[PDB]
Amino acid sequence: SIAQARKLVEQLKMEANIDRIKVSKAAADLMAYCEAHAKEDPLLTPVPASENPFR
Amino acid sequence: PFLYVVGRKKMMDAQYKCYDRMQQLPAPYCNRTWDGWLCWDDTPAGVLSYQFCPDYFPDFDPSEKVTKYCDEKGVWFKHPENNRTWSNYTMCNAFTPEKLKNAYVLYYLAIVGHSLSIFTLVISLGIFVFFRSLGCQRVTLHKNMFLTYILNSMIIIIHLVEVVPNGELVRRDPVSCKILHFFHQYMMACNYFWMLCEGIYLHTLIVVAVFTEKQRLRWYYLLGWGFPLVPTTIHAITRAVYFNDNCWLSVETHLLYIIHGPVMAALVVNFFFLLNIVRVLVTKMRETHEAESHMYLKAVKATMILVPLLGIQFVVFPWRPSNKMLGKIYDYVMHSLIHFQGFFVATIYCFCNNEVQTTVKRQWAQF
Amino acid sequence: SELDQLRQEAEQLKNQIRDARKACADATLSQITNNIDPVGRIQMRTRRTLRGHLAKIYAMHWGTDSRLLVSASQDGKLIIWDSYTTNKVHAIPLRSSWVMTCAYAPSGNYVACGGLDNICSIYNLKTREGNVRVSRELAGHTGYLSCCRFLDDNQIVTSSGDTTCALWDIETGQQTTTFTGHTGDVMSLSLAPDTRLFVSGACDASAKLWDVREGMCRQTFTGHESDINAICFFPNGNAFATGSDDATCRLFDLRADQELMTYSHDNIICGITSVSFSKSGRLLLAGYDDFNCNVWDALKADRAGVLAGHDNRVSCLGVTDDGMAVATGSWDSFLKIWN
Amino acid sequence: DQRNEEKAQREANKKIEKQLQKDKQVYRATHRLLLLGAGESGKNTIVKQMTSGIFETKFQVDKVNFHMFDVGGQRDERRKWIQCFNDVTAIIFVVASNRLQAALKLFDSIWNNKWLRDTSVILFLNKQDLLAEKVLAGKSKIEDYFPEFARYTTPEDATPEPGEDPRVTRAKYFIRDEFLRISTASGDGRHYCYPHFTCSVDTENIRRVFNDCRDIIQRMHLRQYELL
Amino acid sequence: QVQLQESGGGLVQPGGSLRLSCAASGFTFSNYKMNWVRQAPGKGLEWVSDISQSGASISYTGSVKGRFTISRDNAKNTLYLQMNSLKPEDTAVYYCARCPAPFTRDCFDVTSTTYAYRGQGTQVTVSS
Amino acid sequence: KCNTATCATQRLANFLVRSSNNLGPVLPPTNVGSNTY
Ligand SMILES: CCCCCCCCCCCCCCCC(=O)O
Ligand SMILES: CCCCCCCCCCCCCCCC(=O)O
Ligand SMILES: CCCCCCCCCCCCCCCC(=O)O
Ligand SMILES: CCCCCCCCCCCCCCCC(=O)O
Ligand SMILES: CCCCCCCCCCCCCCCC(=O)O
Ligand SMILES: CCCCCCCCCCCCCCCC(=O)O
Ligand SMILES: CCCCCCCCCCCCCCCC(=O)O
Ligand SMILES: CCCCCCCCCCCCCCCC(=O)O
Ligand SMILES: CCCCCCCCCCCCCCCC(=O)O
Ligand SMILES: CCCCCCCCCCCCCCCC(=O)O
Ligand SMILES: *[C@@H]1O[C@H](CO)[C@@H](O)[C@H](O)[C@H]1NC(C)=O
Ligand SMILES: *[C@@H]1O[C@H](CO)[C@@H](O)[C@H](O)[C@H]1NC(C)=O
């Protein structure tokens, strides 16, 4: 009855006091991770033939 | 000269029969007389006595009349030029320009009807074998049904182009000409027996044994390609001992029924399967309480699409009208349903098929 | 009466959290990558095709070696395919016939399956006499199993239809931690590459970040409008994207606690069934109900290509552990390998 | 070497393909049926005619394998798991006699579902004998739930049990027309409805399903040849 | 974040009129089919009405067919429900429900007691 | 003879072969005249 409402408030208060960073820092981190692993991406550029077992 | 000796055998027998018939004469009367090709019964001064022309000579034809004038004053017809007894036989001459022209139209209609049936069915057969997403138990029968039409159309085209217009080939009657007619008489009977296989399978999911899936297609392959080998080999052995014609291009003997007998019997029971399926189809639409006008339209639509598949045109149209105008229309409507049959089956069951249309459109749009 | 101040306090918490999200949101990720050369178009063609299923395929999973893959179907069979030689390795006859998900253990010794039977069955592959049997029947859920992912040789997290996720314990059969808080059926969940955190997307248009050790919702990610059907982590572990039935794919950030970009198109109405990420994270592959999948640029929201090899609606897809290729399963009982 | 291991995979594949063929032969000969009902719909009485969330009854009639699937054990949210029954032969729906409006609003959603547009529904109006005494006694008529029942007329094709009040037959055909008008509202020929009637002592329920399932397989074959 | 807030409702005399307003947010109102559902005291949930995308396909339950009136505004994301000649048997809390998938003819889980795409509703009581 | 619809292509092939390519080497249309019967 009333236990569900109080449980949701306790859960919502726990999620309030968290440290969040700017989107600019998060945008730079995802951009750096996607540009530092371009060589490890077989889907970004076609791998040369006779190498992949999916010939 | 094999066509001559068989004609001589029949004309001598006709001389014998009414040489017996004249022996029962009891008691303006032209006495019974035998002309060279036929004999005339006693006629009480009748004018323009008619009878069917003798089929002894190949050029002549039975679907005409022979005219004889007797006892106008007490004597038979006397020709003004020769002053001798003569019977009118000019009307009994086939190969006349009108008769030949109609045959030439039917000849080109068969070539176009079979050449168009190849380009239409090769695309239809190629789609079913390439698109593995359309793999059903009835599609394998359709692929074998379409393969028989292509093989039948190819042999008929080869027979009408490489054998028919060659005169010296028929006089020499080589063995290659007989084995080609054997393959023509086998692929034709195999086409009319696959119509029964399609009819038997169609009368297996709508009337009886509906719940039984995964039907053993061993009997369908035996009835389709294996069974017609029996009527064809019985007629072949009886065609080299009793009636051996050059290239077997003769339709006068009664030994062709050895093959075309079971073929007609297989199509009669196939016509009975059609009436049962349509009767079941109408019963399935009465429970839905469909409109009366829509119910009749659906039954006729499902009937016209099953005639080319089951070969109903050979059962509902077995007669040939002797009338010249009616006979000409029959030859045009029959050759338009026999030669132009592979094109109709391919258009209805492959091009008009809903599952095939969405498959081709989806396969093409993903580019 | 008593629910007034509780709901009002819960409401004020949502506003101050929403204000905190906008306060830490100044530049959209789309504007950051605006000065970067786009990928453009990619040429990916079907390489291998699998033709050994009868009924529709629900879910699949790759392996750590990117060699084998397991798939489930309504016929009650689990086929461990070979991605290279197209040779079936195993065929596990399931007791039930309504399996809705499957999983592949990282060690390659166990496989999972679940569905309307409300029982997650773990099948051992390295048995004694070679006969694949059931190891433990994880019973206790009050709903249909939707998705599950292995953690260790004895720990597995399942997502059933009772809005609760449970951290099971193989060889014991007793639940260790139950993750509650969802008001809708949880459909799919993904694991971060640390075996410490995992996000679950349910049918309440919200994805909750859970903790395996303590066992409660750490963060709640909202923004979707319909039932969430799939979810997947970013390779770095600080972000994740998910798809729903509203034909939109939103990428969220764990540290920012908010969405960054939306991947959707105008003429796309069908809902997303499965999502996956590349090794570098630049490419985003999402399945759809219009019988084909799509490839999205995770940094600029450009459709780099359309994969339309399947005939029926796709229900599962996944990029390999090394990112060399991506498989895709649909309802036409056909599995394909795309590269 | 690699030739020996590859040959082992080829032998293992043919053994699986042989098992897949043997199981497909026994799978295509079975008809899957979804027995779905509302709360306290009395579907357990149909099970008598021949925790866990699925029950399977492999009853066989006329040498035909039928595979029914009970819903008992699941929750009331039928949105995500109803997509698993788009390949079954038919969905057996049981209605017990506002428990009627909930049945009509569920049958409507199943009939209009985008993945269930080719699955046919078999109806079985349970609690017929109690429905007869409810309308005869008048303690709770169907008039309060459906005010249009007063304007409804009994069809001429009614085949009631001899010695029954035509009010019960009128109520039975009114419920039948309510379910039929929903089925024919979006009926495009891909799937039809088969309403029936059942009591607590009826023993011909397996024969009704057999005749209904026979009509379904017999009607979908006509659509393959485009005869319909 | 899908949010559905219901407005109106309260103590009304028998035979009067009442109006309920359902404000919607967090989604596009011109893509999802809307429904109505009520919960009688001591009884399960009961469906009331539903409205199509453009308000063309309108259907009511037999108890209140013709008596009630519904309308939606896609530009405002607000749903309306009109009541006429209230009865003492209609006293219940009315929820503003929306079945999940957009552009779908089917509409599921509206009557279920555990549904996320519906608001807390407003209590309607009919008495003296 | 064939009067059925099945033995109709052989009937057409027979008429064409006799009509333009009489099997006899002389290839002569039968003479119908007062001198002949
Ligand atoms: C579609 C019908 C077309 C009919 C065209 C008729 C005129 C074309 C020329 C016909 C000449 C035939 C000569 C055949 C000679 C032979 O077979 O020995
Ligand atoms: C799609 C394939 C169609 C094949 C059609 C082949 C037709 C070959 C024959 C055409 C007419 C030839 C007439 C030859 C006359 C002559 O002998 O002088
Ligand atoms: C004389 C030329 C034609 C010869 C054709 C012979 C065919 C032999 C029998 C074939 C049986 C069916 C084979 C394919 C079956 C399938 O479609 O799966
Ligand atoms: C043209 C030459 C034909 C020779 C005769 C062919 C007879 C074929 C008989 C059936 C053989 C194939 C049986 C396959 C059975 C199956 O696929 O279940
Ligand atoms: C020359 C043989 C002709 C056979 C004609 C019947 C072809 C099959 C008919 C339908 C299937 C009959 C039952 C097959 C399976 C069984 O033996 O139980
Ligand atoms: C199922 C087959 C039915 C028909 C079988 C018999 C066909 C007729 C056979 C007649 C043989 C004698 C013919 C004498 C005249 C002639 O040589 O044409
Ligand atoms: C001259 C042609 C003779 C053969 C043509 C008739 C074949 C009839 C086949 C009937 C098949 C009936 C299958 C029944 C299957 C079953 O119920 O067990
Ligand atoms: C595909 C079907 C073709 C059918 C062809 C039908 C031809 C109709 C010809 C009708 C002629 C009627 C007038 C005849 C006059 C006369 O000669 O006395
Ligand atoms: C697809 C079927 C097509 C049917 C075509 C039928 C052709 C009929 C031909 C009639 C020719 C009439 C010629 C009149 C003029 C003339 O004597 O030259
Ligand atoms: C050589 C072929 C030329 C084209 C022949 C006709 C092709 C199909 C045209 C009619 C399409 C009808 C589609 C709706 C009817 C249906 O799906 O059954
Ligand atoms: C016909 O025969 C009878 C009897 O032999 C004979 O008297 C009569 O003259 C004959 N008539 C002719 C025209 O030959
Ligand atoms: C023979 O019959 C034909 C056809 O009727 C006719 O044209 C011709 O004039 C006849 N000849 C004689 C001599 O009667």
mmCIF file of C-alpha atoms and ligand atoms in Angstrom, chain B residues 139-141 143-144 147 151 155 183 186-187 194 217 221 225, ligand 3:
data_model
loop_
_atom_site.group_PDB
_atom_site.id
_atom_site.type_symbol
_atom_site.label_atom_id
_atom_site.label_comp_id
_atom_site.label_asym_id
_atom_site.label_seq_id
_atom_site.Cartn_x
_atom_site.Cartn_y
_atom_site.Cartn_z
ATOM 1 C CA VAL B 139 6.441 -26.193 -55.827
ATOM 2 C CA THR B 140 8.519 -29.300 -56.555
ATOM 3 C CA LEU B 141 5.550 -30.623 -58.529
ATOM 4 C CA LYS B 143 8.981 -27.373 -61.233
ATOM 5 C CA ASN B 144 8.520 -30.851 -62.707
ATOM 6 C CA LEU B 147 10.030 -28.890 -66.983
ATOM 7 C CA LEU B 151 10.676 -30.415 -72.996
ATOM 8 C CA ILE B 155 10.403 -31.441 -79.232
ATOM 9 C CA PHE B 183 10.368 -38.986 -77.624
ATOM 10 C CA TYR B 186 6.544 -39.974 -74.641
ATOM 11 C CA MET B 187 6.940 -36.347 -73.547
ATOM 12 C CA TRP B 194 1.539 -34.767 -64.792
ATOM 13 C CA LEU B 217 6.141 -38.208 -53.655
ATOM 14 C CA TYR B 221 7.458 -39.409 -59.834
ATOM 15 C CA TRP B 225 7.886 -39.837 -65.670
HETATM 16 C C1 LIG G 3 13.905 -37.358 -71.333
HETATM 17 C C2 LIG G 3 14.308 -35.963 -70.928
HETATM 18 C C3 LIG G 3 13.781 -35.556 -69.579
HETATM 19 C C4 LIG G 3 14.212 -36.493 -68.487
HETATM 20 C C5 LIG G 3 13.725 -36.124 -67.112
HETATM 21 C C6 LIG G 3 13.963 -37.207 -66.101
HETATM 22 C C7 LIG G 3 13.612 -36.852 -64.687
HETATM 23 C C8 LIG G 3 13.816 -38.002 -63.736
HETATM 24 C C9 LIG G 3 12.965 -37.958 -62.498
HETATM 25 C C10 LIG G 3 13.150 -36.722 -61.666
HETATM 26 C C11 LIG G 3 12.470 -36.791 -60.327
HETATM 27 C C12 LIG G 3 12.460 -35.486 -59.584
HETATM 28 C C13 LIG G 3 13.825 -34.902 -59.359
HETATM 29 C C14 LIG G 3 13.804 -33.544 -58.685
HETATM 30 C C15 LIG G 3 13.044 -33.562 -57.401
HETATM 31 C C16 LIG G 3 13.007 -32.228 -56.678
HETATM 32 O O1 LIG G 3 12.541 -31.245 -57.283
HETATM 33 O O2 LIG G 3 13.442 -32.179 -55.510
#
